[PDB]
Design a protein around this ligand. Structure first.
Ligand SMILES: *[C@@H]1O[C@H](CO)[C@@H](O[C@@H]2O[C@H](CO)[C@@H](O)[C@H](O)[C@H]2NC(C)=O)[C@H](O)[C@H]1NC(C)=O
Ligand SMILES: *[C@@H]1O[C@H](CO)[C@@H](O[C@@H]2O[C@H](CO)[C@@H](O)[C@H](O)[C@H]2NC(C)=O)[C@H](O)[C@H]1NC(C)=O
Ligand code: UOY
Length: 654
């Protein structure tokens, strides 16, 4: 059909083995910067001793640098604090003597080439956090609960506050943190104070009170605020770093419920609101571009009460595509997919040449169900969660089940080349997979109960595979290492030999497999989100289209480390479909027109009475966030008020 000829020769001289002799227990692997090849391995032992290795050739060869950390014991709760981008910043937390005045850290800012030692004025409680803006700025919590900041990459530490619960870096070196007054974090649960410092502990602005907790997501700063003389709380959103606050149009919750930021960006948020009483599911709400107005997107969305597992996934290889698991009335789990930012959810189309399993009532008609965080949690035979990379357009890889729900059977692997619109069985039985060279190479390793000595590769996006032997002595496979970003052609296989056992790492380079670099001819045109090509509006998702240039399945070549996904948008005309109901409006029947409510019930009346001037007055409609349509329809009607309609029933004081 189609395979690589004389491949065995091209890979043999490019297979680079490494034995990690004195290795057991812990095994931390950290990549340091992009286009560097710097990897750090950290093995800890318990009576203990710590070992540290460093590669500079993508894991092909390491050199023991335990000497650089004076062989001392390193705490793995803090792991390896690696700095942003290509700063080269690396921080290791050392375990210290019982009665010491403060902790100790090993800091390298030259890609682990040289480690300085530093004794701290406090005992750290959290892993130190690098300011996204400035790699030299760090923050940490002491075991005493004090917020310590550093401006010189952890050399000198200053205690900027003394009773902090949670602290986070914002954009432009801002620090947000909750503070308690009486007992502890647990005693003042819902009675904390949200503060902020733009001048690194110089000044402070109390941006919130009666605080339960806070979180950042995209352009937003969320904070859950406790109800006065009540056991409940609700969401409050600020988009100006705490200066102005607004109550989110969302249900309030009790103490046994939560709010989870499923996903957030520069346009909107996906918020999971927990269902009252141990149900193991909630409801997804999609926000407007202000993070204030919320549209109910998905019901009975599976998110566990203990452990907090959810199969909620962003199919990062196609714009507007997300998959998750819902809980059926009949207590079965089905996988749903949204192609339009959670506007509409539906089942995944089963692959053409696949039969329905025992879970399906009709042996002809059924769907594809994906195994993710939840299946894994239930100790099912799922070695990997769904995988997609933004640079490898349309490709989604996952362990699935074809039927009416997620089955307990041993899953085969499924691939989509168009962002989840159509599927096909990639491999049979569980595997571990990786996407090299922005979709140029897909790599697979079998999930076995006994040793393996083989790797499988594909140069046509999982349509055709090829077996390769990387070792004479088989290993008990553990996992795959590859450079974040899915741009390298360097894959590190990991595992341990048969015992008196020891860890090993074989790194295969695909430079010779893809000796030719891609040229203009190798790429083809591809309209993302196609359904009916006859249609003028075909591919319009969120008011616009995107046409891509994609490497041909046939074309086997290297996209290159500098590959730039080339796409062109087509601005479609506005329909009502590009608008969500603002506050006080609803879409009855099938109809796409936003009509005013007869009267506001539940959390809608709660907003109506305790909101603010801007959101309470409405155009009826609001443009869907991320929606970039032009022309066509527009909601033409005056910006009307509702603070009269709600209070109209309430007898008013004089
Ligand atoms: C789902 O994933 C996509 C792709 O990873 C996110 O989109 C990117 O967002 C960043 C934000 O800074 C942009 O600079 C990129 O241009 C976006 N990538 C692409 C390919 O569009 C998206 O935000 C994620 N969804 C949510 C809700 O966070
Ligand atoms: C795979 O690993 C090799 C190193 O083992 C990478 O080689 C680097 O290549 C760049 C140019 O592409 C050079 O500037 C570096 O000096 C090379 N480093 C070494 C140690 O040889 C190679 O880039 C990796 N392959 C891919 C596709 O990322
Ligand atoms: C701070 C903000 C705005 C994010 C809300 C806040 N959130 C949270 O406390 C919160 C709790 C849990 C959780 O996941 C789970 C983890 C384990 C088990 C079950 C669930 N995720 C988030 C709140 O509920 O008030």
């Amino acid at each position: 059909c189609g395979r690589v000829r004389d491949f065995v020769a091209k890979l043999a001289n490019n297979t680079h083995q490494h034995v990690f002799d004195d290795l057991r227990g812990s095994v931390s692997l950290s990549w340091v910067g992009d286009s560097t090849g710097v990897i750090l391995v950290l093995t800890t032992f318990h009576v203990g001793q710590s070992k540290l290795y460093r590669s500079e050739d993508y894991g092909k060869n390491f050199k023991d640098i335990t000497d650089l950390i004076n062989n001392t014991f390193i705490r793995t709760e803090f792991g390896m604090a690696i700095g942003p981008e290509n700063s080269g910043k690396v921080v290791l937390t050392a375990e210290v003597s019982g009665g010491s005045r403060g902790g100790r850290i090993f800091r390298s800012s030259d890609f682990a080439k040289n480690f300085v030692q530093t004794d701290l004025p406090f005992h750290p409680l959290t892993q130190m956090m690098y300011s996204p803006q400035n790699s030299d700025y760090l923050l940490a919590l002491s075991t005493e609960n004090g917020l310590w900041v550093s401006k010189n990459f952890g050399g000198k530490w200053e205690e900027i506050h003394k009773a902090v619960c949670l602290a986070k870096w914002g954009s432009d070196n801002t620090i947000f943190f909750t503070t308690y007054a009486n007992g502890s974090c647990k005693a003042d649960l819902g009675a904390l104070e949200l503060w902020r410092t733009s001048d690194l502990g110089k000044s402070f602005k109390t941006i919130g009170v009666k605080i339960y907790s806070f979180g950042l997501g995209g352009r937003f700063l969320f904070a859950s605020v406790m109800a006065d003389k009540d056991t409940t709380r609700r969401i409050h959103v600020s988009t100006d770093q705490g200066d102005t606050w607004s109550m989110a149009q969302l249900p309030s919750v009790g103490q046994e419920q939560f709010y989870s930021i499923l996903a957030a960006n520069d346009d909107m948020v996906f918020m999971h609101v927990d269902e009252p009483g141990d149900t193991g599911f909630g409801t997804i709400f999609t926000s407007d571009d202000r993070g204030i107005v919320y549209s109910k997107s998905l019901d009975r969305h599976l998110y566990t009460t203990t452990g907090g597992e959810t199969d909620f996934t962003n199919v990062t290889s196609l714009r507007g595509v997300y998959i998750t698991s819902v809980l059926s009335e009949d207590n079965s789990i089905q996988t749903m997919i949204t192609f339009d930012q959670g506007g509409r959810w539906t089942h995944l189309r089963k692959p053409e040449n696949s039969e329905c399993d025992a879970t399906a009532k009709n042996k002809n008609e059924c769907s594809l169900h994906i195994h993710a965080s939840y299946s894994i949690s239930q100790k099912l035979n799922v070695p990997m969660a769904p995988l997609s990379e933004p640079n490898a357009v349309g490709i989604v890889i996952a362990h699935g089940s074809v039927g009416d729900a997620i089955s307990v059977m041993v899953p085969d692997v499924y691939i989509s080349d168009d962002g989840g619109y159509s599927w096909t069985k990639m491999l049979e039985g569980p595997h571990y997979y990786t996407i090299l060279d922005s979709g140029g190479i897909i790599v697979a390793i079998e999930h076995s109960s006994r040793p393996i000595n083989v790797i499988k590769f594909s140069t046509d996006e999982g349509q055709c595979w090829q077996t390769y032997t990387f070792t004479r002595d088989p290993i008990y496979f553990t996992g795959l290492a590859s450079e974040p970003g899915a741009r390298s052609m360097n894959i590190s296989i990991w595992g341990f030999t048969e015992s008196t056992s020891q860890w090993v790492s074989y790194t295969i380079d695909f430079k010779d497999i893809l000796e030719r670099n891609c040229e203009e001819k190798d790429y083809t045109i591809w309209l993302a989100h196609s359904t009916d090509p006859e249609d003028y509006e075909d591919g319009c998702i969120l008011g616009y289209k995107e046409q891509f240039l994609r490497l041909r399945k046939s074309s086997m070549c290297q996209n290159g480390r500098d590959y730039v996904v080339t796409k062109q948008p087509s601005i479609c005309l506005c329909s009502l479909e590009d608008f969500l109901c603002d506050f006080g409006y609803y879409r009855p029947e099938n109809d796409s027109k936003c009509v005013e409510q007869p009267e506001l019930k539940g959390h809608d009346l709660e907003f109506c009475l305790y909101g603010r001037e801007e959101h309470l007055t409405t155009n009826g409609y609001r443009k869907i966030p991320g929606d970039k349509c032009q022309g066509g329809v527009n909601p033409v009607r005056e910006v009307k008020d509702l603070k009269k309609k709600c209070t109209s029933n309430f007898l008013s004081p004089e």
